[PDB]
Ligand binder design. Structure first.
Ligand SMILES: COc1cc(-c2cn[nH]c2)ccc1C(=O)Nc1ccc2c(c1)CC[NH2+]CC2
Length: 313
């Protein structure tokens, strides 16, 4: 209860959804809805440093298809992460509701995944846990990547043997597994016992449904090469013929949300509320401490992108 004291001054809490717990909230000063992920420091033990270093990851990824981090609030025995409002549901449950998605809907949707994952690689990171439960929809049915971090059915085989791997190629395999699920509705390698499933991933043999097209079957063979050297590269995947079917342009992966230059109207509005001059506030925003100022600036930034006035209530 005391852990929420410092936080309830910045947000008003609403529903509860995911099970670490996630509760919907409203940031007071901007009126923008958010999602707050609540982790408990005493349960996870001391594997928070892997989560802390993944929180420092999200602090360095900003992308139209990455769920934005707004605010990290650390208390005595809880850690709070304030994130982007994604009300369109989860990609996993959506695939199950339609059984399978069309080749053209998956293509539209797979292109946002490649855009997200390509961007995180350009920054020197790798998601390493690509699966449909780690992809959210917003109101526009746009995809938002979450949970940077054992999920066996999506792990690359060199990750399986415990050998030395490149983070990028492991994601490429995971995207290949995930592309399969998008168009089929079931895993390419699946089994009740792990030892059989463990073995099936390294054999590389999957059954191909009759409904997957010739343009579809060979991209899966390119993405799910067991040997990483033969796996398709992100560069060649950004303009793959299948990726450019239906929409003939290479995937736009470069982010439209940098750190370097701050928004003027956002900064001026933050200055009149905090009663500071401009450069002083820019210096405090440039620190990017992911306190309440970073959250206010980021949510005030999003507020303008919508079309609302850049004003703090
Ligand atoms: C599980 O919910 C989330 C998790 C993360 C997240 C987890 N890790 N990183 C980010 C980020 C955002 C959300 C989110 O917006 N939740 C949400 C999900 C579904 C619905 C709503 C909100 C609106 C209420 N009506 C039902 C539909």
């Amino acid at each position: 209860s005391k852990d929420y004291d410092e936080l309830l001054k910045y947000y008003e809490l609403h529903e509860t959804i995911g099970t670490a717990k996630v509760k919907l909230a409203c940031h007071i000063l901007t009126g923008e809805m958010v999602a707050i992920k609540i982790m408990d420091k005493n349960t996870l033990g001391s594997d928070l440093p892997r989560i802390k270093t993944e929180i420092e990851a999200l602090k360095n990824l900003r992308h139209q298809h990455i769920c934005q981090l707004y605010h990290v609030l650390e208390t005595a025995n809880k850690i709070f992460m304030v994130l982007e409002y994604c009300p369109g549901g989860e990609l996993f449950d959506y695939i199950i509701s339609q059984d399978r998605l069309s080749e053209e809907e998956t293509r539209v949707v797979f292109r946002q995944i490649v855009s997200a994952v390509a961007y995180v690689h350009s920054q020197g990171y790798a998601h390493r846990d690509l699966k449909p439960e780690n992809l959210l929809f917003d109101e526009y049915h746009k995809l938002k990547l979450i949970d940077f971090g054992g999920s066996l059915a999506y792990a690359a085989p060199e990750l399986i043997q415990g050998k030395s791997y490149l983070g990028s190629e492991a994601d490429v395999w995971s995207m290949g597994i995930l592309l399969y699920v998008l168009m089929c509705g079931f895993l390419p390698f699946d089994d009740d016992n792990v030892m059989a499933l463990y073995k099936k991933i390294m054999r590389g043999k999957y059954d191909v449904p009759k409904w997957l097209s010739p343009s579809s079957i060979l991209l899966l063979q390119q993405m799910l090469q067991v040997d990483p050297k033969k796996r398709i590269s992100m560069k060649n995947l950004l303009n793959h013929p299948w990726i450019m079917q239906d929409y003939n342009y290479p995937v736009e992966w470069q982010s439209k949300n940098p750190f370097i230059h701050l928004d003027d109207d956002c900064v001026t509005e933050l200055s009149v509320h905090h009663r500071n001059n401009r450069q002083t506030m820019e210096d405090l925003i440039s620190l990017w401490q992911y306190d309440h100022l970073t959250a206010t600036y980021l949510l005030l930034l999003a507020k303008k992108a919508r079309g609302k006035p850049v004003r703090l209530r």
